[PDB]
Design a protein around this ligand. Structure first.
Ligand SMILES: [Cl-]
Lengths: 6, 419
């Protein structure tokens, strides 16, 4: 997969 | 000798990027705290797209781990391992205020949708497209999330699908964006390591994230970045003139003396101070700036500032910083453009600002004209453009706002003085 995000 | 932790991530406002003070970002800081734990030096590597990020992560050899706000996937497939989770998010469909709020996933059909190529969200739509065969969506490598949000806000696409957190950080810069609905359950984000016969690295990663969750280190991080802020909005002449009367009188003489001392217009200094703190000597950000001229502890130190809260010290310190920034600009840049450039660097950092000058040159514009470079500055927030630059992403549109804001305050102060 998966990965928007930090 | 090793002693270096190679961490692959995205160059993006949420994961990792360069600001006026050097590297920063939720992902970056969290990964450096980890590197510090292990007693090794951190080496950040950025990936072109997510497909490349994963390609990089699993080929020997080959980064130690990926910190990129990734979602776990299948577990099962030990080919990529994931950590304990550090941040809880929710994917949300994003539409544009003005156009009609889609309510049911099915509403997505016949709208222009764009997501990151190779993403969890592209996969959510891929699944969905089986339930609704005539669902159509686009996916690109030349686009980060901050791009998607930009595109929806300006109207170049109709919908997108992003993690809830990416909104919590960018929404404020996109006044037109709206959450339509949550699309998925809450899930945790996690770091990815390669599989996998040695569980040494992973055991230590998870040891870190566990304790870091009880130290409160994750919540601190969560607050320091997913607490919207940045460049203050222009207050209007009503508020401004009220502060001419109520606040300026306490600081006008500090501004004047610094001007004298450094041979520059003291009202430009005051404009900077206003756009920075609204002339409040006790102002702070959790971003690490403090004082009337909102200085970092490191920059304060370097300008002779033993107390960021002393307005006189802050005003000298920041004025000194601004004028030195302006002396260091390429001789090519003449006044008055020189000062506008100096305000831009004051905010965005010289390095990015030089990025924009080069981008301007290549574009056939004049790198010594503030009017030209200021058109390039906003592109630093577009993957297609910033990826072709040395320092990458930067929320350059806010730097434009910064400069133009200081300049308005500067004009009003010039008008109100000037007998
Ligand atoms: Cl000037």
């Amino acid at each position: 997969x998966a990965x928007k995000x930090x | 000798k090793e002693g270096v932790l190679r961490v692959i991530t995205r160059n993006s406002p949420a994961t990792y990027f360069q600001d006026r003070n050097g590297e920063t970002g939720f992902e970056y800081e969290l990964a450096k705290r980890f590197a510090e734990r292990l007693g090794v030096e951190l080496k950040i590597e950025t990936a072109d797209n997510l497909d490349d990020l994963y390609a990089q992560l699993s080929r020997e050899g080959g980064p130690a781990l990926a910190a990129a706000g990734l979602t776990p996937g299948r577990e099962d497939d030990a080919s990529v391992r994931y950590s304990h989770t550090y941040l809880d998010v929710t994917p949300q469909i994003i539409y544009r205020n003005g156009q009609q709020r889609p309510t049911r996933p099915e509403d997505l059909v016949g709208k222009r949708i764009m997501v990151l190529k190779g993403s969890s969200h592209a996969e959510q739509l891929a699944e969905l497209k089986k339930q609704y065969p005539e669902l159509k969506y686009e996916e690109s490598d030349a686009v980060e999330v901050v791009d998607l949000l930009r595109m929806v806000d300006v109207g170049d696409i109709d919908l997108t699908l992003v993690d809830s957190n990416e909104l919590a950080m960018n929404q404020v810069y996109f006044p037109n964006v709206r959450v339509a609905f949550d699309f998925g359950e809450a899930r945790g984000l996690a770091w990815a390591l390669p599989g996998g016969d040695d569980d040494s690295l992973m055991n230590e990663v998870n040891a870190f994230l566990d304790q870091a969750k009880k130290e409160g280190l994750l919540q601190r991080l969560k607050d320091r970045y997913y607490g919207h802020v940045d460049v203050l909005g222009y207050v209007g002449a009503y508020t401004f003139t009220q502060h001419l009367q109520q606040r300026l009188p306490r600081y006008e003489s500090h501004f004047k003396q610094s001007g004298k001392q450094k041979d520059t217009d003291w009202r430009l200094l005051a404009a900077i101070g206003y756009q920075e703190s609204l002339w409040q000597p006790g102002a702070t950000s959790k971003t690490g700036v403090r004082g009337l001229m909102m200085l970092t502890n490191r920059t304060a130190q370097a300008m002779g500032v033993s107390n960021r809260l002393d307005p006189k010290q802050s005003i000298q310190g920041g004025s000194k910083y601004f004028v030195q920034i302006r002396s260091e600009l390429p001789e090519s840049i003449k006044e008055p453009d020189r000062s506008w450039f100096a305000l831009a660097a004051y905010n965005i950092g010289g390095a990015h600002l030089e990025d924009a000058r080069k981008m301007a040159e290549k574009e056939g514009l004049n790198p010594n004209k503030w009017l030209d470079v200021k058109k390039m500055l906003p592109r630093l927030a577009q993957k297609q453009w910033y990826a072709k630059t040395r320092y990458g992403y930067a929320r350059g549109g806010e730097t434009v706002h910064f400069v133009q804001n200081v300049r308005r305050y500067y004009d009003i102060l010039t008008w109100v003085t000037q007998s």
